[PDB]
Each structure stands twice: as structure tokens, then as C-alpha cells.
Amino acid sequence: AKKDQLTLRGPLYGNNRSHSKTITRRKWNVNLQPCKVKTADGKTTRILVSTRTLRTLKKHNRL
């Protein structure tokens, strides 16, 4: 699906307005980038990841 497999962090389907206070259904899709993840003893096995989870991996020296 449109979610990183590292954790279940789903998107949003919320309410969008304008300069009339009218309500419509808008689809908040989170950022996705298929960066190469690193695990134990090689086997990168590139998977689609989200930018926030990318930064969290970066701050833990896990790429």
C-alpha cells in the first residue's frame, strides 16, 4: 500500500476549505521515498520509506 512497511503509519482523508468556508474531502498522502535501508549483514532489499522515518533512521546511525 501507500505506507512504509517498517511501521503502520497510514495516510489521512480530511477536510479541505478555501476562502468561502466550504468543505470538501481531500486526501492527505504522506511523503514516500524508496530509499535503500540497511539491516544486519548486507541484504539491503530496498523498500519504500517515508521521510520522517528516514530522518529517524538517520538519527540512529541505521541509514
Binding site: K58, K59, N61, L63
Partner: protein, 145 residues
């Protein structure tokens, strides 16, 4: 992200210490030549631990580099060509040289290589900047059909 550098006099030459220009996922942390270390303890415990690590890796890494340089300089590598009409038709790629290196039993990193393709007609050998001090020629025997 880290501030740690490792085993290089090249790449904006500096001292064998902790220093890094803070810019995202740039080459300062894209290479296996700069280890991402935890800076939360990099004051006194990770400090002397990294000093010991630096000295140890210094010693063992130049030891292994001398060993591999001697191995390369004392061993010549072999391919086999498949041409047609007998006229020069093939070449040499880095994938097959890495595979022949794997045949001996080590996974050499690409960071010692600067070429992309080589002419495979007749004897051909190239000396590349393998490491900061150790230099060796990749002697390969190649002949047409």
C-alpha cells in the same frame, strides 16, 4: 549523521580526527570511509574507545592493504574472450574482474576503481589508486578466439 572520519588522506585532506561538514546525506556520510558513530557518548567514553579503534584500524587496515597489494602484484588474473571473424570485438568490464576477485574469496569494494571499461585485445594491465599508500597493477591475461 556523524562527525567521524576514517582512513583517508584524500577527499579534502585533513587530520585523522573527528571533523565533518554538516550537510545531510552528503559524501561525508555516504561512504564506508566515514563511520556513523553515536555522538551522545562521544565525550570521554566513546572518545577513548574511538581513539583505540582508530589506532587499531590504522594498524590492521594498512596490514591487510600491504597483504592484498602483495597478492595482486604477485598474481595475474585470467579471462576468456568470445569474438567473431577474429577481428577485435570484445572488451573488459569491471563486473567480471570483481567476480574473479570473488573467486579468490574476498568482496573488494569499488572505491579503489576509477575506470569503467578496458580494451580486451592483447595483453592489458592498469595500475589504479587502490589505497592511499598501497598501489598494484591488475595484471589480466586476455586473448581473442
Amino acid at each position: 549523521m556523524k562527525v567521524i572520519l576514517k582512513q583517508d588522506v584524500s577527499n579534502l585532506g585533513k587530520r585523522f580526527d573527528v571533523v565533518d561538514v554538516k550537510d545531510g546525506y552528503a559524501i561525508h556520510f555516504l561512504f564506508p570511509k566515514k563511520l556513523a558513530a553515536p555522538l551522545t557518548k562521544k565525550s570521554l567514553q566513546d572518545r577513548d574507545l574511538f581513539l583505540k579503534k582508530q589506532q587499531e584500524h590504522y594498524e590492521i587496515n594498512k596490514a591487510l592493504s600491504h597483504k592484498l597489494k602483495e597478492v595482486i602484484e604477485q598474481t595475474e588474473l585470467h579471462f576468456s574472450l568470445k569474438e567473431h571473424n577474429g577481428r577485435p570485438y570484445g572488451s573488459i568490464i569491471t563486473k567480471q574482474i570483481i567476480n574473479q576477485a570473488h573467486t579468490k574469496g574476498m568482496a573488494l569494494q569499488k572505491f579503489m576503481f576509477k575506470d569503467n571499461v578496458r580494451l580486451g585485445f592483447g595483453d592489458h594491465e592498469i595500475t589504479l589508486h587502490i589505497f592511499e599508500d598501497t598501489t598494484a597493477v591488475l595484471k589480466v591475461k586476455v586473448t581473442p578466439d
